[model samples]
Target: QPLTLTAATTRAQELRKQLNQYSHEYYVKDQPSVEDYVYDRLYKELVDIETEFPDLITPDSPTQRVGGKVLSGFEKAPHDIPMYSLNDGFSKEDIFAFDERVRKAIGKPVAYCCELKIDGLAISLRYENGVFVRGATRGDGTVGENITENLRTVRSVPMRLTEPISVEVRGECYMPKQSFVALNEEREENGQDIFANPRNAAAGSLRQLDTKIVAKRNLNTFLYTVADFGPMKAKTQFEALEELSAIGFRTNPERQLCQSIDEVWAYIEEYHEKRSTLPYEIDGIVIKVNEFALQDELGFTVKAPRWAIAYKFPPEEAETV
Candidate 1:
């Protein structure tokens, strides 16, 4: 039987809420409670209802994610607050030198928040009243090209936050190693030039004028920093990451809080040994002053943050892609 207007409206709301949860579980948590067909059935119903009653459709609806017109080109967006780069540390001594500068500047206790440095494109996602509004590249740190439509197709990027609050977040958009291999294989057979690496593949996919192609790239993200974080109550980077997860952002679980730089080194070493086992590619370990206050005190250089450094790992084989 066909649902009445009121009943269909209410049912659409329920389906939206339910599908969003399922998307979060499958994409963010990587643990799907429902089978693929079950999700597809619910998704189809919502699409039908939205087709029948367009007024009931909203930006945050799951159906709205992928169905969009292709753009002629991206518009340039100037970053209100510049996205800072990390100083690179190629050796153990380099890290110690960074630690020395940090200790000398702060003149107090310090802790390191260590994270995997994703070897992909940096993105800034802006939300208004919990709805994702825009997405941009970290081009030149000061100016970036807006790729809103392309990012919207990323299933891991939630259109609505778990809470109805506005926020800005910085994350890495990446093509998983599996996706890279498969893409290259398909491209090679199609007589297309092979991508240099996964990073380039992800970048190329995101810069596409067509949203349909972008959606097919199997891109994912791991939100790391809350760029516009004045309202967030977290006092430390680790806490901020946890809060991001609570608010329905995909965050890396490999991050660790260390009491000393020596502990930080241990984590980097461990991750280096197991790096190939990971689904996504990481180029280094990003070490940052855990406390926000300490970061403020440590200050920044003209190029990169003085409070953070990237411990780069040596490039492996030429099979980089």
Candidate 2:
């Protein structure tokens, strides 16, 4: 029986809502209420319904998350707010010095937010009226390659925001450890050069000209900071993370709000020892001044933020056969 337009629209709305909720549970919460097969079935149903009635498809629809076209090359897109790199701190003494410098600049005690430094390519996502409009790579900090189609394939990248507002967010896109292993094995079987690490694998995947190829690579992202929150109220870096979560974006939950530099070091040491146990790769821990006001007061250097520092981990030794 041929379905009426009204009927199809109603059904599509239901499926879209259901799928979006499921995605939020699976990606943002890290807790899926439905089995993988069940989720796939629902997703396909939504896709089919949208295909039958193309006019019924909305920007926020789950099906829009993946692009169907292949591109010849990416275009250069300038960042409105330049993506700044963090100055590296290799030791406890280095971190202490950074903390002292921040204190001297602010002339007061300040709180810090510690987050896992994801080992992956940095990307920016711009959303207008709650719909994801563009995604770009951090090329030379000031400008980037527009990878909108490629970024759409990432399941964790939200197609729509929870609120109807415009914002730009920054995050690291990475391939999981298991995905990297599988990809390398497949590549080796195909007589192709294997990626040296998960970070390399992620970058390679996102750089592909074909959206389908990028889709199959199972890339995921963890949004860390909003380039600008606009009217949203986020007084602290920790609050910004919470706001990101509330807006249906995935964020690293291992962040800690520390009252003192010692607490920050403790968080760093704890992660350094336990990093191997995480499913994703983290090369270091990032320590930042929590309060936005304090950050502004301290300001930036020519290349990096003076209010934040990345405490890099020691390089892992290769295993002998």
Candidate 3:
């Protein structure tokens, strides 16, 4: 199918404006005026129109980030700092034990930030002078392939931030349940091997070399951590989200600050049942020592920090023949 130049330009411009506005509302404000299905429809239209006229596509276009640019292979790149993985536990007793160990190390009444552990690929976004400059997958917790161009296609990822600061933000890139279903359906119809699940779909989409492929995947992110404090300061992880959100990053809002382990456990239990009610996916709860200074004292192992642990839920297996 060929696209008329006039139509392509008009469509592209319209989509660019719409998506940018959507990004601010959803990512920064944490309020989505439109439903996922409605947004998906607009996004699909943008992709289809742009695909018909590749020349009409722009750097800021929403249709460029999903699984773009297939690659023959990947090359290794050394990281400035090592990327570490989180240790996981399944039972509540295990979670309690983790808290006990941390309390013993810090030895005082501590504030805790309990956030949902989103089930998706971990990625990093680096901002220099308040503008998004680079993004990478959390490969092996240290070095990851640079996917800046593709990451820009994620509407939640801001090209320019609200504050002028240098920082590296960490988050999860995930496929929405509806988008995951649609992607698999298209792959099946096209006689391609379907993604096993949303996590697989997100990983494959984010790994594409071309921004066009990434734009098609409909991946979203939930930023959870800021490795550097930047100009903004926060005492706890929950406060960090507020700062990040103010600076134009999408973060989960259902998190809570609990004074005791029992309160943290209660919130985790409540969210377990409420998880499916939301558009995104969460595998478990991440508990972090609220005080940054305390966190520093606890230090980290070769992999994860002694101050934090990820308590995961059971994985779901779907039998598709």
Candidate 4:
């Protein structure tokens, strides 16, 4: 028998509320009572129902980003504030040198914003009137290839913000450790070469021609910073995260707002030791000068922003043998 509109609406609302609550508990709090497979099946069911009833589907529906038509080529996109890369440094001395340069540029001591440098592909998402309209990989600092349809496959990425605003957010798209392992297992069983690493897997997954293929990878994102906003005010990188969170975007909660390099270093060291216990891979800590005004004065070089540095950790394994 055909389902009634009233029944579909009630079911959709119930499923959305239930799934969103579970997402918060699992993704935000790191506490999931149900197994991921079970949760995922429920999510898929909800999406299947919503897809059949397009008019009943809400902006928050999980189905929207996963069924877009495949594209032959990406269109060129220019950034409002040019997307910048961070210069990577290996040692504490290099980090100190970066701070010295920051002090010289600003002519004063400044607070640092330190965050886990998620080892993944960098992406930019632009929202208009709080609706996630477009997204792209950071092809180059000035321009990128549009991957709006591809990015929609990430269920964690919201299609529209609850708060109305226009903004561009930059972050990393990564495969969780467990998902990467599962992918490798499937590939190995199929007599195919495995992914070299999680980062490579993430990159390949986001670039897949088929949305269904991308959706299977269980890709995720963290909105790290605002690339641009016409009039919205965010004084520091931490402030920008708060704004993103308030706007209903996923922001990494592990990020630390530190007063000094020592505090930043401590967070880095602590995470480095705990990395194995987590479900994701992080290669380093990205430290940025907190104040946006100070960051502007520091300026940028041709390849990288002078205001930020990536403090790369030593190798995790013994020569990958």
Per-model C-alpha RMSD: 21.0, 20.8, 18.6, 20.5
Query: 1-321, model 3: which lDDT tens digit per residue?
Result: 566788778978988788767754543233457654466568767867876877877766654332122132444333455556665666789788988888898887677898988877778888889888788776545566778887889999988888788888888899988898888999999999787657767877877777788897898888878886678788777788898898989988888998999998898889887877867667778988888889889988654788888877654332112
lDDT of 2 at 16: 90
Per-model TM values vs. the true structure: 0.76, 0.76, 0.74, 0.74
Which wins on TM-score, candidate 1 or candidate 3?
Answer: 1
> Candidates 2 and 3: which is better by TM-score?
2
lDDT of 1: 0.82
lDDT score, residue 91, model 4? 72
**TM-score (C-alpha) between model 1 and the true structure:** 0.76
Query: Model 3 reaches what TM-score against the true structure?
Result: 0.74
Q: Candidate 4, residues 179-227: lDDT per residue as tens digits?
A: 9889999999999868767876887777766777887789988888887
Model 3, backbone clash pairs (residues 3+ apart or across chains), number? 16
Tell me the number of clashing residue pairs for each predicted model: 0, 0, 16, 1
The reply for model 2, stretches above 4 Å from the true place, is 1-72, 315-321
Model 1, 1-321: lDDT tens digits are 376789889989999999988866643333457764588779878978987888889877876442122222678866777786676676888888888988999896589999999978789999888899999887656777789999999999999998888888998999998999999999999999777667768878887778898988899999999888746789899999999998989999999999998998898889998898899988889998999988888777555778999987654433255
Question: Please, what is the whole-model Cα lDDT of each candidate in the order they appear?
Answer: 0.82, 0.82, 0.75, 0.76
Error of 2 at 136 (Å): 0.5
TM-score of 4: 0.74
Q: Which regions of candidate 1 fall more than 4 Å away from where they truly are?
A: 1-72, 318-321
- Give the lowest summed-lDDT range of ten residues in model 2: 63-72
Expressed as tens digits, the lDDT of each residue in 1-321 for candidate 2 is: 277888888999899999888866643333457764476677777767777888888878866542111222678778899887677776899999999999899998888999999988789999998999999887656777789999998888999999988999999999988788899999999999887767768877887777888989998889989897866799899999999989989999999999999999999999987887788888889999999999889888555788899987643322212
